[PDB]
Design an enzyme around this catalytic site. Sequence first.
Site, mmCIF file in Angstrom:
data_model
loop_
_atom_site.group_PDB
_atom_site.id
_atom_site.type_symbol
_atom_site.label_atom_id
_atom_site.label_comp_id
_atom_site.label_asym_id
_atom_site.label_seq_id
_atom_site.Cartn_x
_atom_site.Cartn_y
_atom_site.Cartn_z
ATOM 1 N N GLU A 35 0.822 -1.212 0.000
ATOM 2 C CA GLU A 35 0.000 0.000 0.000
ATOM 3 C C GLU A 35 0.857 1.263 0.000
ATOM 4 O O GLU A 35 0.533 2.227 -0.710
ATOM 5 C CB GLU A 35 -0.945 0.012 1.208
ATOM 6 N N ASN A 46 -7.429 9.742 -5.542
ATOM 7 C CA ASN A 46 -8.250 8.968 -6.456
ATOM 8 C C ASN A 46 -9.002 9.879 -7.405
ATOM 9 O O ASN A 46 -9.217 11.065 -7.130
ATOM 10 C CB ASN A 46 -9.212 8.129 -5.637
ATOM 11 N N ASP A 48 -12.016 9.997 -7.965
ATOM 12 C CA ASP A 48 -13.278 10.450 -7.394
ATOM 13 C C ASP A 48 -13.108 11.617 -6.436
ATOM 14 O O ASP A 48 -14.099 12.099 -5.879
ATOM 15 C CB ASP A 48 -14.071 9.290 -6.753
ATOM 16 N N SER A 50 -11.468 11.570 -3.557
ATOM 17 C CA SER A 50 -11.014 11.090 -2.264
ATOM 18 C C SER A 50 -9.508 10.872 -2.297
ATOM 19 O O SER A 50 -8.884 10.835 -3.364
ATOM 20 C CB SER A 50 -11.729 9.794 -1.882
ATOM 21 N N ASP A 52 -6.213 8.595 -0.225
ATOM 22 C CA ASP A 52 -5.745 7.538 0.659
ATOM 23 C C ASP A 52 -4.513 8.033 1.418
ATOM 24 O O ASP A 52 -3.624 8.643 0.824
ATOM 25 C CB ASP A 52 -5.329 6.294 -0.131
ATOM 26 N N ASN A 59 -8.780 5.568 3.386
ATOM 27 C CA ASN A 59 -9.462 6.427 2.428
ATOM 28 C C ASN A 59 -10.448 7.387 3.096
ATOM 29 O O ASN A 59 -11.159 7.034 4.043
ATOM 30 C CB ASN A 59 -10.138 5.526 1.384
ATOM 31 N N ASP A 101 -15.402 -4.069 9.941
ATOM 32 C CA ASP A 101 -16.671 -3.574 9.400
ATOM 33 C C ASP A 101 -17.471 -4.605 8.611
ATOM 34 O O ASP A 101 -18.567 -4.271 8.140
ATOM 35 C CB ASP A 101 -16.481 -2.296 8.569
HETATM 36 NA NA NA Z 1 -3.385 1.722 -2.893
#
Ligand code: NA
Length: 129
Positions: A35, A46, A48, A50, A52, A59, A101
């Site tokens: 990551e 991203n 969109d 957002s 990370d 995110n 979650d």
């Molecule tokens: Na990633």
Amino acid sequence: KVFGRCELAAAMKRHGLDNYRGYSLGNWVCAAKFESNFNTQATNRNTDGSTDYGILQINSRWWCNDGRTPGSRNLCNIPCSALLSSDITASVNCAKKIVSDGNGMNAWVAWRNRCKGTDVQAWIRGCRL
Ligand code: NA
Ligand SMILES: [Br-]
Ligand SMILES: [Cl-]
Ligand SMILES: [Cl-]
Ligand SMILES: [Cl-]
Ligand SMILES: [Cl-]
Ligand code: NA
Ligand SMILES: [Re]
Ligand SMILES: [Re]
């Protein structure tokens, strides 16, 4: 902070991720490698809008507030910047909520594609633990 592999394994153990929600320590080390390249200051925007953040690329749509993901949530109740600290505590505590979650570690795309189903214990071998 850019961690070494064994250094991060030891920090993740200190901060409570060992076997959290049944995921062994190597899962978390492997996820962090792919990551973020073990860099707490990693960020990825991203398409969109957002972003990370941090060593586990958490995110902003659901998990943290950055003020620039309109309409999003902040389930970890933190500024996203807290996920960039050299101290991994905030990232660990937020990851605990994420992995709880319902979807487990599948929330982390790099874990699903590169760690899941592999010999993840390899990621902690050779380390002082
Ligand atoms: Na990633
Ligand atoms: Br730490
Ligand atoms: Cl926002
Ligand atoms: Cl905030
Ligand atoms: Cl699970
Ligand atoms: Cl392991
Ligand atoms: Na948010
Ligand atoms: Re460290
Ligand atoms: Re192994």
